[PDB]
Design a protein around this ligand. Structure first.
Ligand SMILES: *[C@@H]1O[C@H](CO)[C@@H](O[C@@H]2O[C@H](CO)[C@@H](O)[C@H](O)[C@H]2NC(C)=O)[C@H](O)[C@H]1NC(C)=O
Ligand SMILES: *[C@@H]1O[C@H](CO)[C@@H](O[C@@H]2O[C@H](CO)[C@@H](O)[C@H](O)[C@H]2NC(C)=O)[C@H](O)[C@H]1NC(C)=O
Ligand SMILES: NC1=N[C@H](O)[C@H]2[C@H]3O[C@]4(O)O[C@@H]([C@@H](O)[C@@]2(N1)[C@@H]4O)[C@]3(O)CO
Ligand SMILES: *[C@@H]1O[C@H](CO)[C@@H](O)[C@H](O)[C@H]1NC(C)=O
Ligand SMILES: *[C@@H]1O[C@H](CO)[C@@H](O)[C@H](O)[C@H]1NC(C)=O
Ligand SMILES: *[C@@H]1O[C@H](CO)[C@@H](O)[C@H](O)[C@H]1NC(C)=O
Ligand SMILES: *[C@@H]1O[C@H](CO)[C@@H](O)[C@H](O)[C@H]1NC(C)=O
Ligand SMILES: *[C@@H]1O[C@H](CO)[C@@H](O)[C@H](O)[C@H]1NC(C)=O
Ligand SMILES: *[C@@H]1O[C@H](CO)[C@@H](O)[C@H](O)[C@H]1NC(C)=O
Ligand SMILES: *[C@@H]1O[C@H](CO)[C@@H](O)[C@H](O)[C@H]1NC(C)=O
Lengths: 173, 120, 1140
């Protein structure tokens, strides 16, 4: 079912990027209605400006030019109880850099209880000219070869010590 | 018939307090909206019944003129108890006292009958 | 003179028969349940005959001498009482009329005396109980200790319920509680999980939980199950544990405690089920079986024109060609059966017609043959043969419906039996069945008599209550499916209890009939009823049973593989390689970093294994390498991994089956089997027995096939019903009687669905599946409700229209489960016996090193006397010492411990502060007295005291008790951990364990378990690995399935911790049907084929019906095979210890 996964923090310039905000209900069985707001403040700036609101089935995106015309919704479709809210940007640009705050509003229907809740997820993204391999990924690759070389080296060294001893035994009898 | 335990005859001295004790027993657990208890008095066997106390959500004491303010509820119905108390009994209190208990979901209605006699 | 006549009357052939005939007739009457008024006179007649029989016995025997001859025999006392109650009943009687009838029930008992040999059989069963006494104390002690541990650890836990956070009117939790008692009322306030009886259980810890947002967790109110399921009091805890020991609905208790307590407590259940249930039950079987052998064997040892018509006769008898014709017929019959096997809920007319024609040819072939046999052998000669008598009825029945009831046909399936003579096993199944009504007929008859008495007794006692209360166990105020109102129904409940299903029914008997009565009756049926069943099973089973530089290089590699570091290094890789498997789950996406290292890590592993394999080839060569079973296993695994790597590495590839090949990766833990000596040994034992196991499976399939075929004819296509989708409630049938009618409703109504069961009798394969659930007793009841309810193929099911169909299930259980299991158990244990004989009479479950250790433990058995010790020179030593060696001192201490144990029992949830302080102080005195005893033994004994093993345990317990005490105190002043505090107080249960030293009987039983620990460990290791491979297969395959029944948050396949929890439950085979239910549904509207699954790439939650069925079924069978092993290991050790 639903799992919460943090969004990627590095985006390549001039390429599409997907921002992930996933919020999971404590109990899957319960049914509630959700809506979301995403507000972004450009890097080196203070405060926040709401960029988009998604309620019901239609998505409403703020009119400002920085985010105008290059955003798409990757959230849950037709559920009306979204769970997963994600925003996809086409033609990523330098202007799209900074702190992104996404707030979720959920109406939970219980037997005689109606509950309204708010959860906030914050994602910070910095654009970059060329994508770079993560430290864990690069280090792991380098680390893997060293291990392979040592074992191979260990086996060869092992055979060499073993071979001389075996050969010597043959000579005596 | 419903299991209702009362003394068939209750003999009480004039001026003493008379507890009219009846036991009602049925399966399930009593419900306040559900449990209803009614008490009636008759001066004689064939005489018209006069309701003097009811349980409907709570105790309702009808304050019949014939009893003044001498009737009191004296039982915890949740215990299957629906007894009443007649304080400072007078000779005119002699007669027949009926307890009727209808308890949902039990369809059956219990009935206890006490013949109260007043000594001298 | 009169005495002679009476005496003459007393011993007569007819009189015993006359007394007996009347008694059997009376039994039919008891079954009335509201007999007509006219029957009363009949009642009078029965009373008179009893008195008349009694008078002759009393008149002749007594000689007016005080009836010395008459009352001397024990059996007559029962007889004397029955007549009297009737006289007494007429005479002023006690108030309880319902109670009054039960006494008359004993008349039925009188039957034991009247039948020949029943008196002998019952006495033997009772003789059996005397042996069982010691195990009983241990069960009580064992159940008692666990009850104490359970109570301390889980008291008040079942109380948790989600409670709403915001309340109108300033109400408080306490204020709300007194005000509401209504069921609807309880619901608004607390969560309540969608139509369930009680509020959802919540938890404080991160592992357990959880309550929906807007609801908070607080503990208040009654425990679930009417308050019956709780750990609050010692008595209640004892009932909960007893249920766990017999494993009745244990799956539910485990699920409930785990949810409230948190998953970490799963450990408590593993130890209790593993030691408390598997072990305790086994002990009972060994003792009953062991006891039966002595008595059975001990008793056995003491004993030791006209001529022309005849001309035709030469031809036929010459034409029978017994070499070809009889042999030809069996082959022909098997073929007909296969023809019968072809059926479905929906069949086109053309297919149906072929069945009609195929049946006729078969009808024609057998019929020609039947006439032929009699002419050749004539009627007297022909009819005499037993099989022939059997066949003519078969021919006769076929002919009768040749052109003329549905029920009549269903019998055609039986013919298939003739195959038994040729087959060796078929012979075994038939032989076992014969004993039940043959030599063991008297014993089997007792079981029938006992079941009858209980059904009637239950009916008399609780029959009236069920009808009046109803509402105390239903909403429609109508009778539940299982009830005690009628004899057939009362009988069904008793039958269910014979299978281990008592708790579900018992809660209900209690709601209507009260706790004291319901508990006593059910407990007796279970103990007494089961003992008879156990005796029959065991009795039946036992009786039935009896340059050339290349050469140097090749030598060197051999050196490397043989070397210990390498063997050791390889094993580490296997454990490490297997472990990486656990990390992949639905949550792998979070923690992206671990995912990257794991992906890279596998490549290093693939290279190491491929490298290792090459060394194997050079060292062993191809011929040696491929003639080994293990190597082939190793080679196959590296290859699958290798193909994925090249395909992944080669690139391009990654479509369809290539992905499927990857799932086989779960198979990796398998290499590990060769490496561990303990694990490998268990496998040797299994391979040895697969051929033997194989013959039986075929017999069962043949036996089951008849039942499955029979089942298909009766219920195929009749399980469909129109149900309201919102609450899944079948419509009345007053409206929507047939499928055609149901569809019209859908057109004008949104949520009505016409739907099948999912496990049913639509086809022979499905019938095979439905039958398996019924045999196991898991998930069976859902099916039976369907079978009885059913009316016709396209018609809506009426409620209990069939009613008697239950007979079909009852017969299958007796034959399908009781007999085959008897056969399954008999062959497997025997095969194990042969294996032991072959390997020089040594146990087959232990590694050589384990064997040396096992012998050392054997030494502990010896009682050679240890040195007495010397009374010190000093008087104080003499005085202090003189008291300790006294017999009274041990008894006084022993009594003291029992007194201590009773104190622990008094603790209960909600005890007042005053009670808590006294218990604390009372314990301190014991803490002081016990510490005091230890010091005293030490002053007198000195170094000698440390010599005894028991003294050391006693000394250690005191240190733990005092230390546990300080720690509890220390925690209070500086910390506030409730969970931590409960665990610390657990230290005291240690003193209770000292009770064991005093009882020699229990000590021997406990010691035996210790002996089998080495064998049990190996099986446990093997079992763990199999569970592990399955968990991995499950995580990839079943995560994402829709959550329905048995699958919900927790107890789901989403992660490795979760998968392990489920697999453990299913090991006992419990609730296996429940897990399988979500996997089965495929396609709308059962499930949505493409689902978003936020946070992940995969689409759909549809179970694979084919893959799912193989997985659950295979696991059930495999676990069962290993469990047979525990049964075998425990029995062997038990015989040896008792034997000494
Ligand atoms: C199927 O069952 C549902 C669930 O009870 C029925 O729905 C109820 O219908 C009545 C009257 O239409 C409403 O007053 C209730 O509120 C409904 N329950 C809820 C909670 O929705 C429904 O009537 C049934 N379907 C049909 C066709 O009878
Ligand atoms: C299936 O059930 C329907 C419903 O009763 C039967 O069809 C008719 O039902 C209507 C009510 O709409 C009655 O007026 C008719 O009398 C019913 N049929 C007849 C011939 O009386 C139908 O017969 C049932 N059997 C089927 C359709 O196989
Ligand atoms: N001792 C039991 N083991 C089964 O796992 C249980 C499941 O199956 C069954 O048929 O009905 C329910 C319960 O009563 C069972 N009882 C019955 O067997 C069940 O929870 C869902 O069906
Ligand atoms: C993401 O947005 C694109 C619009 O370009 C849409 O086609 C796609 O379906 C979205 N992703 C998901 C998972 O819905
Ligand atoms: C990205 O945006 C630029 C405008 O700066 C536009 O010219 C270009 O076409 C966009 N990229 C694609 C692939 O359309
Ligand atoms: C990009 O950002 C700069 C400053 O943040 C702004 O002046 C410019 O107008 C933006 N580009 C577009 C196309 O609006
Ligand atoms: C709760 O629902 C109301 C609708 O009455 C809405 O106005 C409000 O914004 C919701 N709360 C939150 C935190 O979104
Ligand atoms: C008063 O007693 C009568 C008995 O005649 C009973 O039917 C009625 O329900 C009682 N009244 C109430 C309010 O219960
Ligand atoms: C809620 O508070 C008011 C004060 O205005 C008080 O009068 C009332 O009794 C409170 N409600 C309850 C249920 O006590
Ligand atoms: C529903 O009724 C309509 C009549 O307008 C009919 O044409 C249609 O076939 C019906 N639906 C089904 C599934 O039979």
């Amino acid at each position: 079912g639903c799992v919460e996964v943090d969004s990627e923090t590095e985006a390549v310039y001039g390429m599409t990027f997907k921002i992930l905000c996933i919020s999971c209900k404590r109990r899957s069985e319960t049914n509630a209605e959700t809506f979301t707001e995403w507000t972004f403040r450009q890097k080196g700036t203070e405060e926040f400006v709401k960029i988009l609101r998604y309620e019901n089935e239609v998505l409403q995106l703020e009119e400002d030019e920085r985010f105008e015309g290059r955003v798409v919704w990757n959230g849950s479709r037709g559920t009306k109880d979204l769970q997963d809210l994600s925003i996809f940007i086409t033609n990523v640009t330098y202007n799209h850099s900074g702190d992104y705050e996404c707030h979720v509003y959920r109406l939970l229907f219980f037997e005689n209880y109606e509950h309204n809740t708010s959860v906030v997820k914050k994602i910070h993204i910095e654009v970059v000219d060329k994508a770079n391999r993560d430290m864990a990924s690069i280090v792991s690759e380098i680390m893997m070869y060293v291990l392979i070389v040592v074992l191979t080296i260990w086996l060869v060294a092992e055979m060499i010590y073993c071979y001389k001893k075996i050969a010597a035994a043959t000579e005596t009898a | 018939s419903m299991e209702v335990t009362v003394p068939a005859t209750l003999n009480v001295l004039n001026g003493s307090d008379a507890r009219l004790p009846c036991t009602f027993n049925s399966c399930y657990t009593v419900n306040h909206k559900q449990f209803s208890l009614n008490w009636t008095y008759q001066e004689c066997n064939n005489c018209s019944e006069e309701m003097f106390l009811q349980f409907r959500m709570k105790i309702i004491n009808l304050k019949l003129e014939r009893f003044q303010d001498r009737v009191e509820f004296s039982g915890n119905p949740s215990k299957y108890d629906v007894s009443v108390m007649l304080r400072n009994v007078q000779p005119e209190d002699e007669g027949i006292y009926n307890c009727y208990i209808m308890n949902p979901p039990d369809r059956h209605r219990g009935h206890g009958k006490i013949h109260l006699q007043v000594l001298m | 003179p009169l005495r002679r006549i009476s005496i003459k009357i007393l011993v007569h052939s007819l009189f015993s028969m006359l007394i007996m005939c009347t008694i059997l007739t009376n039994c039919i009457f008891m079954t009335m349940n509201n007999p007509p008024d006219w029957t009363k006179n009949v009642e009078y007649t029965f009373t008179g005959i009893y008195t008349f029989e009694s008078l002759v016995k009393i008149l002749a025997r007594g000689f007016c001498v005080g009836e010395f001859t008459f009352l001397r025999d024990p059996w007559n006392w029962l007889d004397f009482v029955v007549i009297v109650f009737a006289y007494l009943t007429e005479f002023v009687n006690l108030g309880n009329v319902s109670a009054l009838r039960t006494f008359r029930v004993l008349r039925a008992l009188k039957t034991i005396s009247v039948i020949p040999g029943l008196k002998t059989i019952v006495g033997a069963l009772i003789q059996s109980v005397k042996k069982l006494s010691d195990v009983m104390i241990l069960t009580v002690f064992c159940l008692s200790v666990f009850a104490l541990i359970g109570l301390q650890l889980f008291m008040g836990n079942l109380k948790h319920k989600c409670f709403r956070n915001s309340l109108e009117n300033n109400e408080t939790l306490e204020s709300i509680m007194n005000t509401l008692e209504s069921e609807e009322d309880f619901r608004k306030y607390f969560y309540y999980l969608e139509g369930s009886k009680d509020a959802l259980l919540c938890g404080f810890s991160t592992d357990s939980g959880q309550c929906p947002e807007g609801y908070t967790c607080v503990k208040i109110g009654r425990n679930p199950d009417y308050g019956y399921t709780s750990f609050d009091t010692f008595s209640w805890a004892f009932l909960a544990l007893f249920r766990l020991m017999t494993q009745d609905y244990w799956e539910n208790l485990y699920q409930q405690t785990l949810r409230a307590a948190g998953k970490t407590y799963m450990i408590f259940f593993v130890v209790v089920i593993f030691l408390g249930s598997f072990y305790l039950i086994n002990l009972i079987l060994a003792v009953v079986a062991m006891a039966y052998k002595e008595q059975n064997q001990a008793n056995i040892e003491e004993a030791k024109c006209s001529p022309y018509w005849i001309k035709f006769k030469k031809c036929i008898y010459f034409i029978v060609m017994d070499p070809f014709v009889d042999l030809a017929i069996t082959i022909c019959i098997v073929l007909n059966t296969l023809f019968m096997a072809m059926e479905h809920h929906p069949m086109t007319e053309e297919f149906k017609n072929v069945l009609a024609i195929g049946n006729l040819v078969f009808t024609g072939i057998f019929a020609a043959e039947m006439v032929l046999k009699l002419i050749a052998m004539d009627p007297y000669e022909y009819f005499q043969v037993g099989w022939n008598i059997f066949d003519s009825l078969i021919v006769t029945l076929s002919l009768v419906e040749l052109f003329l009831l549905s029920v009549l046909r269903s019998f055609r399936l039986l013919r298939v039996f003739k195959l038994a003579k040729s087959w060796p096993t078929l012979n075994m199944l038939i032989k076992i069945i014969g004993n039940s009504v043959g030599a063991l007929g008297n014993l089997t008859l007792v079981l029938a008599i006992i079941v009858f008495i209980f059904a009637v007794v239950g009916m008399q006692l609780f029959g009236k209550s069920y009808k009046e209360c109803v509402c105390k166990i239903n909403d429609d105020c109508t009778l539940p499916r299982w009830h005690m109102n009628d004899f057939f129904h009362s009988f069904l409940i008793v039958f269910r209890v014979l299978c281990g299903e008592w708790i579900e029914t018992m809660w209900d008997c209690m709601e209507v009939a009260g706790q004291a009565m319901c508990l006593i009756v059910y407990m007796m049926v279970m103990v007494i009823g089961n003992l008879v069943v156990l005796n029959l099973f065991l009795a039946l089973l036992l009786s039935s049973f009896s340059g050339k530089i290349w050469w140097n290089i090749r030598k060197t590699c051999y050196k490397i593989v043989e070397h210990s570091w390498f063997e050791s290094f390889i094993v580490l890789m296997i454990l490490l390689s297997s472990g990486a498997l656990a990390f992949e789950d639905i949550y792998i996406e979070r923690k992206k970093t671990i995912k990257i290292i794991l992906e890279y890590a596998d490549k290093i592993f693939t290279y190491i294994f491929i490298l290792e394999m090459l060394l194997k080839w050079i060292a062993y060569g191809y011929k040696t390498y491929f003639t080994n079973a293990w190597c082939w296993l190793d080679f196959l695994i590296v290859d699958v991994s290798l193909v994925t790597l090249v395909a992944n590495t080669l690139g391009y590839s990654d479509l369809g089956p290539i992905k499927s090949l990857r799932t086989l990766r779960a198979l990796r833990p398998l290499r590990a089997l060769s490496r561990f000596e303990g694990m490998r040994v268990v496998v040797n034992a299994l391979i040895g027995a697969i051929p033997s196991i194989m013959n039986v499976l075929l017999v069962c399939l043949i036996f089951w096939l008849i039942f499955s075929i029979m089942g298909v004819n009766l219920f195929a296509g009749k399980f469909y019903e129109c149900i309201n989708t919102t609450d899944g409630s079948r419509f009345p049938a007053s409206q929507v009687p047939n499928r055609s009618e149901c569809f019209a409703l859908m057109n004008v109504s949104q949520n009505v669905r016409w739907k099948n069961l999912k496990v049913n009798f639509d086809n022979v394969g499905l019938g095979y599946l439905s039958l398996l659930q019924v045999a196991t007793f898991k998930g069976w009841t859902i099916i039976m409700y369907a079978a009885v309810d059913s009316v016709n193929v396209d018609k809506q099911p009426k409620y209990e229209y069939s009613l008697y169909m239950y007979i079909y299930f009852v017969v299958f259980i007796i034959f399908g489960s009781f007999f085959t299991l008897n056969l399954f158990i008999g062959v497997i244990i025997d095969n194990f016996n042969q294996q032991k004989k072959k390997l020089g009479g040594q146990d087959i479950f232990m590694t050589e090193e384990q064997k040396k250790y096992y012998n050392a433990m054997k030494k502990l058995g010896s009682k050679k006397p240890q040195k007495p010790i010397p009374r010190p020179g000093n008087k104080i030593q003499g005085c202090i010492f003189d008291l300790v060696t006294n017999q009274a001192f041990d008894i006084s201490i022993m009594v003291l411990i029992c007194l201590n144990m009773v104190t622990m029992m008094v603790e209960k949830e909600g005890q007042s502060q005053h009670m808590t302080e006294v218990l604390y102080w009372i314990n301190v005195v014991f803490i002081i007295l016990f510490t005091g005893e230890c010091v005293l033994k030490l002053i007198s004994l000195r170094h000698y005291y440390f010599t005894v093993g028991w003294n050391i345990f006693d000394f250690v317990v005191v240190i733990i008790s005092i230390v546990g005490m300080f720690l509890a105190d220390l925690i209070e002043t500086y910390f506030v951990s409730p969970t931590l505090f409960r665990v610390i107080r657990l230290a005291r249960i240690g003193r209770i364990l000292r009770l064991v030293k005093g009882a020699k009987g229990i000590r021997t039983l406990l010691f035996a378990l210790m002996m089998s620990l080495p064998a049990l460990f190996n099986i446990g290791l093997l079992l763990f690995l199999v569970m592990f491979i399955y968990a991995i297969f499950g995580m990839s395959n079943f995560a994402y399935v829709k959550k329905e029944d048995g699958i919900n948050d927790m107890f789901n396949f989403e992660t490795f911790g979760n998968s392990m929890i489920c697999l453990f439950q299913i090991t006992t085979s419990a609730g296996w049907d429940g897990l399988l239910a979500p996997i089965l549904n495929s396609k709308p509207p059962d499930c949505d084929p493409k689902k978003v699954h936020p946070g992940s790439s995969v689409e759909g939650d549809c179970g694979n019906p084919s893959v799912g069925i193989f997985y659950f079924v295979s696991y059930i069978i495999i676990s069962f095979l290993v469990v047979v092993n525990m049964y075998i290991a425990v029995i062997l050790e038990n015989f040896s210890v008792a034997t000494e």
